[PDB]
Amino acid sequence: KLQDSLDAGVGNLVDADLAKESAKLQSLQTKQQLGVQALSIANQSSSSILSLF
Amino acid sequence: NALKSDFDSLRDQITKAASNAKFNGVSIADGTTTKLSFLANSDGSAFTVTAKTL
Numbered sequence: 001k002l003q004d005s006l007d008a009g010v011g012n013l014v015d016a017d018l019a020k021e022s023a024k025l026q027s028l029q030t031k032q033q034l035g036v037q038a039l040s041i042a043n044q045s046s047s048s049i050l051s052l053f
Numbered sequence: 054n055a056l057k058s059d060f061d062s063l064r065d066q067i068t069k070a071a072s073n074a075k076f077n078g079v080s081i082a083d084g085t086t087t088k089l090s091f092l093a094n095s096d097g098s099a100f101t102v103t104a105k106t107l
Contacts, residue, residue, distance in 0.1 A: 005076060
């Protein structure tokens with residue numbers, strides 16, 4: 001029983017809560033796609049003034 | 054006499070059981086402390102557990 005308590009305690013210290021990680025994963029993948037889109041938007045700034053010449 | 058001998062052996066086993074009731078060096082039942090205090094909130098206020106000596 002003591003060995004089981006020590007092993008369960010190690011699990012309490014280090015184990016991930018995977019149900020929480022699934023939500024973090026979905027939101028981070030959306031955030032990464034939005035960041036790529038935002039970088040594409042920022043990349044376009046130089047071409048705006050080409051029309052002035 | 055046989056009953057008395059069995060009784061004394063079981064009595065010594067109680068001492069062994071109580072002394073081994075430790076989780077990573079701390080015990081709530083071995084008599085070595087009056088209480089353990091665990092964190093209750095982020096300010097460090099305690100969650101007291103009174104020791105119960107076995």
